Amino acid sequence: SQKYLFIDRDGTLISEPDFQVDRFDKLAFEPGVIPQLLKLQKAGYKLVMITNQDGLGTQSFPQADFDGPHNLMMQIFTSQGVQFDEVLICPHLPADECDCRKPKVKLVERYLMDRANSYVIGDRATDIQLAENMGINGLRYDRETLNWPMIGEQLT
Amino acid sequence: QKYLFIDRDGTLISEPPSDFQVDRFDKLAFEPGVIPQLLKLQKAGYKLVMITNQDGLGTQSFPQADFDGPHNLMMQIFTSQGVQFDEVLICPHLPADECDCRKPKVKLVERYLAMDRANSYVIGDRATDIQLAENMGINGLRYDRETLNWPMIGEQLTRR
Numbered sequence: 001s002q003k004y005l006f007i008d009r010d011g012t013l014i015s016e017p018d019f020q021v022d023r024f025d026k027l028a029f030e031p032g033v034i035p036q037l038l039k040l041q042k043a044g045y046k047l048v049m050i051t052n053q054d055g056l057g058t059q060s061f062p063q064a065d066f067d068g069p070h071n072l073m074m075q076i077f078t079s080q081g082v083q084f085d086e087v088l089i090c091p092h093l094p095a096d097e098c099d100c101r102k103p104k105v106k107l108v109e110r111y112l113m114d115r116a117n118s119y120v121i122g123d124r125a126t127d128i129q130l131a132e133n134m135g136i137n138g139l140r141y142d143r144e145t146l147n148w149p150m151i152g153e154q155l156t
Numbered sequence: 157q158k159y160l161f162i163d164r165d166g167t168l169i170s171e172p173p174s175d176f177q178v179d180r181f182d183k184l185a186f187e188p189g190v191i192p193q194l195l196k197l198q199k200a201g202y203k204l205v206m207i208t209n210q211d212g213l214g215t216q217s218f219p220q221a222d223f224d225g226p227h228n229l230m231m232q233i234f235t236s237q238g239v240q241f242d243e244v245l246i247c248p249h250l251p252a253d254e255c256d257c258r259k260p261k262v263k264l265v266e267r268y269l270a271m272d273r274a275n276s277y278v279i280g281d282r283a284t285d286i287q288l289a290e291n292m293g294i295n296g297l298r299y300d301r302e303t304l305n306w307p308m309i310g311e312q313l314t315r316r
């Protein structure tokens with residue numbers, strides 16, 4: 001059964017800016033993310049992106065402002081051979097108290113896979129809580145202390 | 157030292173067929189496999205040098221600020237992924253300028269002419285790139301997305 005990696009976007013795949021990648025000039029890739037995701041794919045992991053984008057589609061974060069950098073990030077990954085099976089987004093504000101905001105598991109219900117060998121990889125405590133809620137492993141990404149080369153090595 | 161002298165537009169990234177200049181982020185697109193293949197080439201001992209004509213860069217026809225956004229992002233992607241260019245050599249002149257530095261002229265790479273000529277290459281998509289190689293006394297590889305792409309180059313230049 002399938003090994004999955006459920007991977008956070010902001011602060012994990014790309015750098016976390018006001019916490020919104022709403023301009024092209026705010027886009028920056030995390031070190032080693034491409035070669036390591038390629039390594040992880042070769043080892044048999046399928047990749048799923050999962051992200052909370054607070055207030056996506058509002059005055060404070062229009063969909064168009066999100067789309068440009070996001071679509072470009074996706075181009076870059078895809079052209080280099082990194083493929084995400086799905087990109088799962090919660091667009092809600094915390095105050096909305098919605099059903100889909102990480103660490104709630106709604107976005108990933110369908111997956112609820114080889115649980116023993118699947119991971120959430122993200123840079124926040126809420127990513128680790130998502131792993132607990134899904135009943136799978138959690139890796140707390142840190143650019144300095146638990147980064148892409150380390151994860152690539154560990155999981156292969 | 158073995159070097160790869162690599163074109164930018166149409167080689168590392170796609171080249172826009174309207175004005176042939178990446179002056180907006182929506183005109184930036186990486187060529188397939190360029191990142192893993194340059195990493196492979198680096199691991200085999202190649203050093204990388206970027207060499208590019210950017211016609212009219214820094215003038216109203218191609219403002220510096222317009223080039224800088226996509227170019228700096230491109231460079232951030234390379235650097236963050238482990239791809240290091242020793243130098244990025246740019247000719248900003250128009251053809252009519254008759255400058256000393258426009259490819260296939262060798263002025264920009266004069267210091268390299270220094271290197272292992274038998275194992276060094278120019279990689280680019282145009283006749284201009286192949287002519288640069290000849291002018292440098294080294295091999296030229298004509299990049300084509302289908303017939304001589306990044307995976308093929310990665311394999312070819314690491315063949316033992």
Ligand SMILES: [Br-]
Nearest residue numbers: 032035149238
């Ligand atoms: Br790496």
Ligand SMILES: [Br-]
Nearest residue numbers: 008051052102
């Ligand atoms: Br998040």
Ligand SMILES: [Br-]
Nearest residue numbers: 074075078079
């Ligand atoms: Br894509």
Ligand SMILES: [Br-]
Nearest residue numbers: 172173174175
């Ligand atoms: Br165009």
Ligand SMILES: [Br-]
Nearest residue numbers: 081189192307
């Ligand atoms: Br590749």
Ligand SMILES: [Br-]
Nearest residue numbers: 208209259284
């Ligand atoms: Br050129």
Ligand SMILES: [Br-]
Nearest residue numbers: 296297298304
């Ligand atoms: Br050739």
Ligand SMILES: [Mg+2]
Nearest residue numbers: 008010011123
């Ligand atoms: Mg994050």
Ligand SMILES: [Mg+2]
Nearest residue numbers: 163165166281
């Ligand atoms: Mg070219």
Ligand code: NA
Nearest residue numbers: 165171176177
């Ligand atoms: Na060009």
Ligand SMILES: [Zn+2]
Nearest residue numbers: 090092098100
């Ligand atoms: Zn939500």
Ligand SMILES: [Zn+2]
Nearest residue numbers: 247249255257
């Ligand atoms: Zn010039």
